[PDB]
Amino acid sequence: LDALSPEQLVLTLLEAEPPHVLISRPASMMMSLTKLADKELVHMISWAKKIPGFVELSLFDQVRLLESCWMEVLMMGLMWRSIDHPGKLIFAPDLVLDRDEGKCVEGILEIFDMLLATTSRFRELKLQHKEYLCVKAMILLNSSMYPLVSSRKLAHLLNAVTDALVWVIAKSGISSQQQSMRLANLLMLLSHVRHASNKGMEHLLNMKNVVPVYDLLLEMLNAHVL
Amino acid sequence: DALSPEQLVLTLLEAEPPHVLISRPASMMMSLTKLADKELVHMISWAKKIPGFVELSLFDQVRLLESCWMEVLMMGLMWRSIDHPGKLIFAPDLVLDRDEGKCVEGILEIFDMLLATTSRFRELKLQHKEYLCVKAMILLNSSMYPLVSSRKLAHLLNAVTDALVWVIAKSGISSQQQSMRLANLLMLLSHVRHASNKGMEHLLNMKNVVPVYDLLLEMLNAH
Ligand SMILES: COCc1cc(O)cc2c1O[C@@H](c1ccc(O)cc1)[C@H]1CCC[C@@H]21
Ligand SMILES: COCc1cc(O)cc2c1O[C@@H](c1ccc(O)cc1)[C@H]1CCC[C@@H]21
């Protein structure tokens, strides 16, 4: 119970953060992104396994969640590292792209503008490092409805992370009306993260020399299962 | 004053869309599309009745209506289907159960997302008052752009949020549960958004039916 306590939880999520990912480049932009995602997914699995209680859900829910949330989590990570640089998307240490470069590949410019607009909203709200840690965890736990309708366990976990975020916002010292307003503003942004995620998935599956992230993810998920 | 919690909920109540009868004189997708086209007309009227909506720039109004329509229709569908598991009450003469979704390809998947989200609202015992606030929030939170008149949209969205927070408060539950319920409700919005994106994808990937999107744009120019 205590390992899920507001303060410990945030610190545990902190240490659980993924390492920097170097794409290491010897169609192409899409080849870079795809090779980057594949690499991040490996670390995303490790990250999820570090969230207190995640490993104690049925493997079925673990897989359900990971398969449903990956694109949202990657994008949430992207928005957070791009947060202080308007007009830019810091995908990785050797892959910084600005809005315009999104004109090369068709359909990508639209997605970039969604990510840049959602990122601008997090900057305006002045998203805190620990609010970000809670939100990203919530994105994983709230990615799939089915595993909730072990279900008892997922609901408990989702509430723990929410309590943690409510706690984080509380020590912000702001009024009670503002605390509710901030919680609501943060959670309403999840809809936009989900939205950019669906567009990214759609664009990815409408694609035809790049890396097969989804299938590689399923391989990782099976290994996670074995 | 019209944005005050109690007054706002009562105003949203009266603003509710009327029942919509498609009046089939046979394609499921043909019925669905004829229904949506009819609902959209009433959805515009509904939005105009939300206190302050008509005062945003026509730019934001059009912006919000264009991107939220599918989410609002689905939020409406889930609310009327809430007490009947395995079924979707699309309209007074169009009740469809899950399996009828196997006919058209790609639809069963969407029906299951809708039935699952509806299932979740039933479990949370979504109230009429909460539903009225959430649906208004779906419209106001549909597009990020008109927010990043913006001052006006932000204040409007906050007003509806206060109303929901107020609704939850008179629930008489503890403060920890109040935060938990607000959070549980708002997280469901991600799922409504999700079923909405799937429905939009399927509609455009669709191949003897009605062009809802173009008709909506006509209504928007009329607006
Ligand atoms: C294999 O995915 C490539 C990929 C293919 C695609 O069609 C669409 C996308 C892809 O990578 C996603 C991505 C997001 C965050 C990351 O940290 C990494 C990748 C975003 C990047 C821009 C659109 C979307
Ligand atoms: C013109 O829309 C037809 C339509 C075409 C489509 O490809 C997908 C969908 C459509 O109607 C939507 C709808 C939702 C709520 C309503 O009250 C009415 C329609 C949902 C119904 C199931 C999938 C999605």
Side-chain angles (χ1 to χ4, degrees), chain B residues 72-84:
Chain B
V72 174
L73 287 188
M74 292 177 154
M75 186 61 225
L77 165 72
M78 296 183 272
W79 171 246
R80 28 185 209 276
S81 305
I82 209 178
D83 297 311
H84 304 279

Side-chain angles (χ1 to χ4, degrees), chain A residues 20-24 26-54:
Chain A
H20 276 109
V21 180
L22 291 190
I23 188 173
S24 301
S28 74
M29 167 186 200
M30 296 314 290
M31 173 54 244
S32 300
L33 294 178
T34 57
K35 186 184 175 179
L36 173 60
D38 182 58
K39 282 184 170 177
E40 299 191 83
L41 285 185
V42 175
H43 294 117
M44 191 204 281
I45 306 301
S46 312
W47 163 76
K49 288 194 194 185
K50 286 171 189 158
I51 301 177
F54 181 77

Side-chain angles (χ1 to χ4, degrees), chain A residues 163-207 209-219:
Chain A
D163 269 318
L165 170 66
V166 173
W167 171 72
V168 162
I169 295 176
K171 57 175 181 171
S172 169
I174 64 178
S175 63
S176 289
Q177 193 264 34
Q178 293 176 299
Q179 287 182 58
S180 296
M181 215 73 94
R182 189 160 177 83
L183 175 56
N185 284 164
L186 257 27
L187 303 195
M188 285 193 287
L189 277 185
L190 301 190
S191 284
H192 293 104
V193 181
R194 179 69 65 94
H195 189 20
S197 182
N198 294 324
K199 291 299 176 173
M201 284 307 284
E202 189 181 321
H203 183 293
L204 173 65
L205 295 182
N206 280 324
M207 192 171 168
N209 341 315
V210 292
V211 182
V213 195
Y214 186 72
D215 294 311
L216 291 173
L217 171 64
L218 292 194
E219 287 183 46

Side-chain angles (χ1 to χ4, degrees), chain B residues 29 32-33 36 39 73 80 90 107 110-111 199 202-203 212:
Chain B
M29 297 315 286
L32 291 176
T33 59
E39 300 192 85
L73 287 188
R80 28 185 209 276
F90 278 97
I107 286 301
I110 304 181
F111 273 21
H202 181 290
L203 174 64
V212 189

Side-chain angles (χ1 to χ4, degrees), chain A residues 3-24 26-151 153-207 209-221:
Chain A
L4 290 174
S5 303
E7 205 146 48
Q8 353 257 189
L9 186 55
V10 167
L11 290 181
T12 298
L13 287 179
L14 170 57
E15 297 299 337
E17 280 294 79
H20 276 109
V21 180
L22 291 190
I23 188 173
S24 301
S28 74
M29 167 186 200
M30 296 314 290
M31 173 54 244
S32 300
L33 294 178
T34 57
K35 186 184 175 179
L36 173 60
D38 182 58
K39 282 184 170 177
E40 299 191 83
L41 285 185
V42 175
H43 294 117
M44 191 204 281
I45 306 301
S46 312
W47 163 76
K49 288 194 194 185
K50 286 171 189 158
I51 301 177
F54 181 77
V55 147
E56 295 201 56
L57 296 174
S58 68
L59 205 61
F60 200 64
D61 289 332
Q62 291 176 50
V63 171
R64 275 176 173 171
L65 299 174
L66 293 177
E67 172 178 351
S68 299
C69 82
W70 73 270
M71 180 67 110
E72 298 182 72
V73 174
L74 291 185
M75 289 182 161
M76 184 66 232
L78 168 72
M79 296 180 278
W80 170 246
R81 24 182 211 274
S82 304
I83 206 178
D84 294 311
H85 301 280
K88 302 212 170 182
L89 294 175
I90 295 66
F91 281 96
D94 238 337
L95 185 49
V96 182
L97 302 168
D98 42 64
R99 215 210 75 119
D100 285 36
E101 285 174 295
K103 303 187 180 186
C104 302
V105 180
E106 215 180 318
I108 287 302
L109 180 65
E110 183 182 2
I111 305 183
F112 275 21
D113 282 318
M114 287 183 81
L115 298 170
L116 289 170
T118 303
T119 300
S120 297
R121 184 62 188 180
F122 279 121
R123 178 169 57 246
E124 299 305 298
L125 295 174
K126 296 194 162 214
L127 184 70
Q128 297 297 287
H129 212 308
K130 38 204 191 307
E131 297 176 313
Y132 159 72
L133 291 174
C134 287
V135 164
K136 184 163 71 176
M138 292 181 60
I139 291 180
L140 163 62
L141 303 172
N142 188 56
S143 69
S144 183
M145 263 292 296
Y146 305 91
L148 210 59
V149 308
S150 181
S151 185
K153 289 182 176 179
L154 181 62
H156 186 72
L157 245 175
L158 195 34
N159 288 318
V161 178
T162 297
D163 269 318
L165 170 66
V166 173
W167 171 72
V168 162
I169 295 176
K171 57 175 181 171
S172 169
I174 64 178
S175 63
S176 289
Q177 193 264 34
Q178 293 176 299
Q179 287 182 58
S180 296
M181 215 73 94
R182 189 160 177 83
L183 175 56
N185 284 164
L186 257 27
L187 303 195
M188 285 193 287
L189 277 185
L190 301 190
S191 284
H192 293 104
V193 181
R194 179 69 65 94
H195 189 20
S197 182
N198 294 324
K199 291 299 176 173
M201 284 307 284
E202 189 181 321
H203 183 293
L204 173 65
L205 295 182
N206 280 324
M207 192 171 168
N209 341 315
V210 292
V211 182
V213 195
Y214 186 72
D215 294 311
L216 291 173
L217 171 64
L218 292 194
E219 287 183 46
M220 293 177 246
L221 297 183

